[PDB]
Design a binder for this molecule. Structure first.
Ligand code: ATP
Ligand code: ATP
Ligand code: MG
Ligand code: MG
Ligand code: ZN
Lengths: 124, 618, 595
DNA sequence: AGCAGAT
DNA sequence: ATCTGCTTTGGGTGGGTGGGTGGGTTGAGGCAATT
């Protein structure tokens, strides 16, 4: 399995994605508000507007801090960026604002019991 | 060792002839400015023969060992030329080497599907024939690029098949690598992988060149990358490629036959059409000068089928049919056709079939069908399965294959009602609707129909009304712009004239032959009667760059003629209708096309009126 | 061990065999290598004469010794042509008794046999391997294999770890040959009682391919063998030689298969002052009278000449003849003779025929599920004559399916995706009966003929044969037939079927006369008079003529003139032929129309 | 490649 | 526990001494019964 040196580094792209999600504004940041709605079980679909990414890139360039071309990278290879964006959102999901019935969900109980079992195993 | 030497020898050839370098540079510049030209170059085998005889002989007789070196040399030259500042990651990962295509003169390798034998395997050949089938285009995996998240480095894998290269290699299954050499997880990067298109076509021997009592044969061809959709069924092509064999051919113990041969086929390098004539400035100026004449219509009409005596008006109608009308579709949805349909009914031996055959030969696109030889499915389309992919699809029929052309139907009255319904639908709507095998679609069939039929009793009877003389439905009859009824009336002067004409025709001898000698290429790349080639050029020019528009004067002429024609005591061989108005407008537009005019004038209306009056009231 | 001795023995036959003062096989080999025909035809009577032991081996185990006689030929060819070349093919000729196709059974397996039959189908050429270059998947070790096509071979199962079947063929370094498949049907007369004719599969190699066409009688020398496709094997014959009475190669390409000595005979025969009489008398020697029909059949066999005008129009060059008449006239016998004299011919009954049976039919391959085209009677008879008997029993649709192939000489198909225009250049000779079985003079001619004017106008000459009871003629016919029943001129008044067929082929491929101006003026005046005669006859009777006279009849007269000229290898047609053509037209078609 | 069997 | 070995998808690179109540389904052509 030989190797090549492509002119793409996913670390700078991941940092750019995180900055775009946490800082972009068009009220508070648009995508942070959408994530807030997602956390409260209101919303179940996050749509990323490439227009917003282009606007953010050009604003960064105008500020002088030029960065990597995110829109072209997404267009040229889009399967990877779904996972990258999902990871970025997972990292920055805000805490819920409205109380919900966690015990009703099967997964919450199952994962709580998994945590308890892991704690018991570690204590041994 | 030898490969590098050959690459150097081909590189020295490309240096000596600068046309290929200039073409490569122009292609690269055009790509940089930008829809996108492929990485292919046409080299003349004659120049290679003049430069180095051994290399030319090797490329013609051992292409496997001589074409890859030349392709690599060309790719190296192109890379040395390239000056793109920033390469996109896809471009860096892309596997797009330059491909080589040939022209010139093949001495004894110019063959046909019938003459290709086992002696020609592993050689560069050129084959001519008709394309009869065409599979669906499916991408083919060549290179895959992966990313190791932990290691932060990309890897790649190269795949090869029996039909993607000229030298035999170990087969590579299409399984994508999942784990790195050290056990890291690998995620495929599709956007950086390389896939190329792939299609398989069948080329059939020309029917007219076949031996006596033998059906034509065919050969399978493969086209990859930029040669994928350069041909459609019913096209005349000249294909250049390498004749190969594949598989184990029964040498594996699984097949117990012991009497089956190897598979064979051609990997194409070039495709050369054999349909549109390229017009020169001299030809265009001659066309215009002729069109300025006041009797151009008569000259062009007479030039059609010089060996058929009489039938002036039918020839004029055939000319107007070759030129066609102007197609208009309205916003509301009404779609007015600009095609002219013609029906000939008459007594036996009146030159109807010969006129059909002449129209078949002259017209740019024309398909031949008869009454008892066709079928409802064979005219519209058939449901079959694709050998390459095993997917359900449709095969175009006679009417669909002749899209934007002409279809000649001989023995129109010998068809069946079930088969007549398909033609009724096609002429009425100009489309084909198909509901079979879970397929719902609408194929476009915009063609002009010229047909010849015989009366019910085999000979037109004046006493009986036209309805009793023709067995076709009235609805089907109303869809023909011009109905010509031709009768063989015995006369002295006419008989002497026709007999003398026939005798003169039968005494022709083609140049290059002796008396009593029964009648039987060099390169691949490449009141006076008007010759047929010039007639074709004229028709192409006129129907390609003229769109006449009506004018109030032609409008007055047409309305007057329609008004007088409909309410007139004299009987008509066909019943007047509002469709006659559309036919009048269509004929006027076509005649305006003949003169190379942007507007329809009084003269065009008066010509259309005279033609329709002759058709209706003799 | 023994193989080298066998090879040495067959090499000494090719180098030591002289019947007088000429080395027949050494000289045959040199002459064949000079024109690039790598083969040697050996007569088995000569081998039985040199050493009978060599014949005993070649006949006891044919598929083991034949491969060792090919290598001997190759070695001798190298010695004779190269001053210090694929394996040479061996073609065999024998005069042993022919085994009937249906008598081949388990007692003849792996033996040399001679048999005759009719070829019904031929396959598209395949490619068989003769020298493979192979490589190993794992260790990449290169090797080669050599194969002879005589089966009792596969890639090595174990390399030379490497798993089973480690070798892959390197195609760009291998060499292949040609292979063809043929279906052989037994002759109609040989078939036993109440049995359908039986087929047999055959395969030929290299220089024995593209030697036959469907529908031609052939004689085959080969090996009756078996190949596995439970404990049964499907038999087949491995051809070692083909002999035919038809020069198919000349017929498909140029003029060939005529020796200068044979060619000289044809010119001498053409120079005969009265060749027309000899040919007329040579057709149906056993049928009394009917001289005009025999002359018409001579003209039909000869054919006219076809022209391709600069504008592209093609003019038919074949002649179509219809025989309408009463029973017992010997129309069917004339058709059965014409089928037997013509180089290519098919005899079909209008009743037992169909539109697809004639022309071509669309068929589906059960394996590939793909439609293909199979030729019918008019394709199988291409370049020859079709004898459609019982023309009146044919259905209206099946008869209508013949118009284009009779006039335009093409078969347009548009069915199951397949869209083409085949070629069918055939002459139709039809026999029919009137409506009432006998031509009844009391009723008008429009009542005795149910054929439409369109189909009738396509026939060049129409013969209305009427049987009149005349005592003198009746006595003559009785004497002739009794002589036939109770009972060889060959003295310049008649030529056998074989010679006549060869002469027809020679004339067709050698001559194509053209009309001179005088003939043109004569034919043109005659056409004007005939058309006037039909009009005077029509004006007299309200009824419209049932036998038409259109331009096709003018072209038919021209074709008859050209055939009469071609009969004598005359490059130009003069008035002496126009007069005969006009006489024949008046004797057949104007005679039919007058009634 | 998954599963079925012999050492 | 390890080494050795067969067979798919569905399709003619298994077949017709396995058949069509084991699935691969439209197109053409011939025949009896219906007209
Ligand atoms: N006006 C003509 N000039 C020259 N040849 C003619 C003319 N009319 C008929 N012919 C001759 O008629 C011959 C055959 O007639 P053709 O097939 O053209 O007639 P058709 O109208 O199609 O007849 P059918 O009703 O039998 O199909 C051709 O060889 C052609 O030479
Ligand atoms: N010179 C002859 N004239 C007529 N018949 C003959 C002659 N010589 C032999 N025959 C007999 O003619 C019979 C063949 O029938 P023939 O071909 O005459 O029928 P046809 O008239 O063409 O057909 P159909 O009676 O069905 O209309 C054979 O029995 C043959 O013996
Ligand atoms: Mg016709
Ligand atoms: Mg008979
Ligand atoms: Zn090995």
């Amino acid at each position: 399995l030989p190797s090549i040196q492509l002119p793409v580094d996913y670390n700078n792209l991941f940092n750019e994605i995180t900055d775009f999600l946490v800082t972009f504004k068009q009220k508070g940041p648009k995508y942070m508000a959408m994530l807030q709605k997602v956390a409260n079980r209101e919303l179940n679909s996050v749509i990323i507007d490439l227009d917003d990414i282009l606007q953010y890139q050009n604003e960064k360039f105008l500020q002088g801090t030029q960065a990597d071309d995110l829109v072209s990278a997404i267009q040229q290879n889009a399967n990877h960026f779904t996972e990258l964006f999902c990871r970025a959102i997972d990292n920055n999901m805000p805490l819920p604002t409205k109380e919900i019935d966690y015990k009703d969900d099967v997964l919450d109980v199952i994962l709580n019991q998994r945590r308890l079992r892991n704690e018991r195993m570690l204590s041994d | 060792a030898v490969f590098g030497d050959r690459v150097r020898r081909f590189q020295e050839f490309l240096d000596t002839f600068t046309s290929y370098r200039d073409s490569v540079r122009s292609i690269q510049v055009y790509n940089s400015n930008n829809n996108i030209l492929p990485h292919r170059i046409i080299i003349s085998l004659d120049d290679l023969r003049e430069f180095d005889r051994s290399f030319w002989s090797g490329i013609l007789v051992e292409p496997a060992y001589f074409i890859p070196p030349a392709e690599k040399a060309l790719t190296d030259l192109a890379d040395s030329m390239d000056d793109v500042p920033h390469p996109n990651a896809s471009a860096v990962s892309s596997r797009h080497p330059w491909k080589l295509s040939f022209k010139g003169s093949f001495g004894a390798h110019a063959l046909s599907p019938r003459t290709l034998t086992a002696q020609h395997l592993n050689k560069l050949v050129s084959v001519e024939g008709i394309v009869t089938k065409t599979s669906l285009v499916r991408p083919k995996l060549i290179r895959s690029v992966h990313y190791a998240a932990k290691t932060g480095r990309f890897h790649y894998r190269d795949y090869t098949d029996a039909t993607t290269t000229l030298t035999t290699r170990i087969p590579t299954p299409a399984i994508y690598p999942t784990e790195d050499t050290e056990g890291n997880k690998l995620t495929t990067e599709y956007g950086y992988s390389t896939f190329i298109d792939h299609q398989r076509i069948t080329v059939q021997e020309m029917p007219e060149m076949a031996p006596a009592g033998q059906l034509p044969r065919s050969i399978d061809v493969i086209l990859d990358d930029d040669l994928v959709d350069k041909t459609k069924p019913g096209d005349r092509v000249n294909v250049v490629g390498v004749f190969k064999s594949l598989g184990a051919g029964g040498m594996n113990q699984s097949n117990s036959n012991t009497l089956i041969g190897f598979k064979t086929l051609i990997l194409g390098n070039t495709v050369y059409p054999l349909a549109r004539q390229m017009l020169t400035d001299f030809d265009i100026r001659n066309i215009n000068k002729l069109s300025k004449k006041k009797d151009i219509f008569d000259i062009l009409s007479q030039s059609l089928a010089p060996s058929i005596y009489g039938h002036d008006h039918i020839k004029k109608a055939i000319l107007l049919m070759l030129m066609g009308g102007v197609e208009k579709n309205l916003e509301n949805g009404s779609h007015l056709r600009g095609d002219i349909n013609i029906l000939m009914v008459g007594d036996p031996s009146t030159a109807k079939s010969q006129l059909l055959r002449f129209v078949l030969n002259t017209a740019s696109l024309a398909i031949a069908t008869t009454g008892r030889g066709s079928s409802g499915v064979g005219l519209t389309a058939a449901v079959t399965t694709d050998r390459e992919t095993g997917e359900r699809r449709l095969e175009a029929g006679a009417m669909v294959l002749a899209d934007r052309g002409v279809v000649c139907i001989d023995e129109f009255d010998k068809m069946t009602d079930v088969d007549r319904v398909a033609i009724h639908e096609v002429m009425e709507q100009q489309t084909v609707t198909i509901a079979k095998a879970g397929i719902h679609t609408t194929l476009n069939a915009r063609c002009s129909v010229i047909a010849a039929a015989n009366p019910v009793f085999g000979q037109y009877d004046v006493n009986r009304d036209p309805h009793q003389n023709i067995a076709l439905p009235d609805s089907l009859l109303s869809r023909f712009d011009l109905l010509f009824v031709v009768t063989d009336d015995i006369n002295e002067i006419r008989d002497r004239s026709i007999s003398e004409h026939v005798l003169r025709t039968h005494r022709y001898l083609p140049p290059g032959y002796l008396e009593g000698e029964p009648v039987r290429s060099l390169a691949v790349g490449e009141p006076k009667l008007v010759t047929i080639p010039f007639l074709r050029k004229y028709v192409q020019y006129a129907k390609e760059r003229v769109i006449p528009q009506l004018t109030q004067e032609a409008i007055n002429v047409i309305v007057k003629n329609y008004t007088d024609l409909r309410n007139d005591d004299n009987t008509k061989k066909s019943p007047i209708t509002a469709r006659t108005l559309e036919t009048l407008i269509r004929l006027a537009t076509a005649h305006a096309k003949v003169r190379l005019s942007k507007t329809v004038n009084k003269v065009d209306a008066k010509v259309a009126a005279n033609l329709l009056r002759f058709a209706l009231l003799g | 061990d023994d193989n080298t001795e066998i090879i040495k023995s067959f090499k000494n036959f090719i180098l030591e065999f002289r019947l007088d003062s000429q080395f027949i096989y050494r000289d045959q080999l040199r002459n064949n290598i000079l024109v690039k025909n790598y083969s040697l035809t050996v007569n088995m009577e000569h081998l039985i004469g040199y050493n009978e032991d060599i014949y005993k081996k070649l006949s006891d185990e044919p598929s083991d010794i034949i491969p060792l006689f090919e290598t001997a030929i190759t070695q001798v060819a190298k010695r004779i042509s190269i001053l210090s070349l694929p394996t040479f093919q061996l073609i065999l000729n024998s005069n042993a008794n022919q085994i009937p196709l249906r008598d081949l059974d388990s007692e003849h397996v792996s033996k040399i046999v001679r048999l005759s039959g009719i070829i019904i189908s031929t396959s598209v050429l395949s490619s068989r391997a003769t020298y493979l270059s192979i490589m190993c998947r794992n260790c990449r070790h290169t090797t080669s294999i050599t194969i002879n096509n005589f089966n009792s071979v596969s890639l090595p199962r174990s390399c030379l770890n490497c798993g089973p079947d480690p070798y892959i063929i390197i195609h760009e370094s291998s060499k292949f040959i040609d292979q063809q498949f043929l279906k052989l049907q037994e002759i109609p007369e040989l078939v036993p009682v109440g049995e359908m004719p039986r087929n047999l599969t055959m395969t030929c190699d290299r220089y024995l391919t593209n030697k036959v066409i469907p529908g031609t009688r052939v004689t085959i020398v080969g090996i009756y063998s078996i190949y596995n496709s439970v404990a049964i094997r499907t038999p087949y014959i491995k051809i070692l030689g083909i002999q035919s009475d038809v020069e198919t190669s000349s017929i498909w390409n140029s003029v060939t298969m005529f020796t200068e000595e044979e060619e000289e005979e044809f010119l001498q025969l053409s120079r005969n002052p009265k060749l027309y009489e000899i040919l007329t008398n040579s057709i149906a020697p056993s049928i009394f009278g009917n001289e005009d029909i025999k002359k018409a059949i001579v003209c039909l066999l000869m054919g006219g000449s076809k022209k391709i005008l600069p504008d592209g129009m093609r003019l038919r060059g074949d002649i179509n003849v219809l025989l309408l008449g009463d029973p017992g006239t010997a129309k069917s016998q004339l058709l059965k003779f014409v089928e037997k004299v013509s180089p290519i011919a098919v005899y079909t009954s209008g009743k037992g025929s169909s539109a697809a049976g004639l022309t071509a039919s669309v068929q589906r391959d059960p394996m590939t599920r793909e439609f293909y085209l199979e030729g019918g009677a008019m394709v199988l008879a291409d370049g020859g004559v079709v004898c459609i008997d019982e023309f009146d029993k044919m259905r209206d649709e099946d008869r209508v399916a013949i118009h284009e192939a009779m006039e335009q000489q093409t078969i347009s198909i548009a069915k199951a995706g397949i869209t083409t225009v085949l070629n069918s250049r055939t002459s139709v000779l039809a026999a029919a009966n009137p409506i009432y079985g006998r031509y009844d003079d009391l009723k008008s001619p429009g009542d005795n003929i149910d054929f439409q004017t369109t189909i009738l106008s396509r026939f060049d000459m129409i013969f209305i044969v009427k049987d009149d009871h005349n005592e003198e003629r009746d006595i003559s016919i009785a004497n002739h037939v009794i002589n036939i029943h109770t009972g060889q001129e060959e003295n310049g008044s008649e030529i056998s079927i074989e010679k006549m067929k060869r002469y027809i082929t020679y004339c067709r491929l050698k001559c194509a006369p053209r009309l001179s101006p005088q003939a043109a003026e004569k034919l043109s005046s005659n056409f004007v008079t005939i058309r006037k005669q039909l009009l005077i006859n029509e004006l007299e009777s309200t009824e419209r003529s049932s036998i038409p006279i259109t331009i096709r009849q003018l072209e038919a007269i021209i074709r008859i003139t050209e055939s009469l000229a071609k009969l004598e290898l005359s490059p130009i047609a003069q008035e002496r032929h126009v007069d005969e053509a006009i006489r024949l037209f008046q004797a057949s078609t104007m005679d039919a129309a007058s009634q």
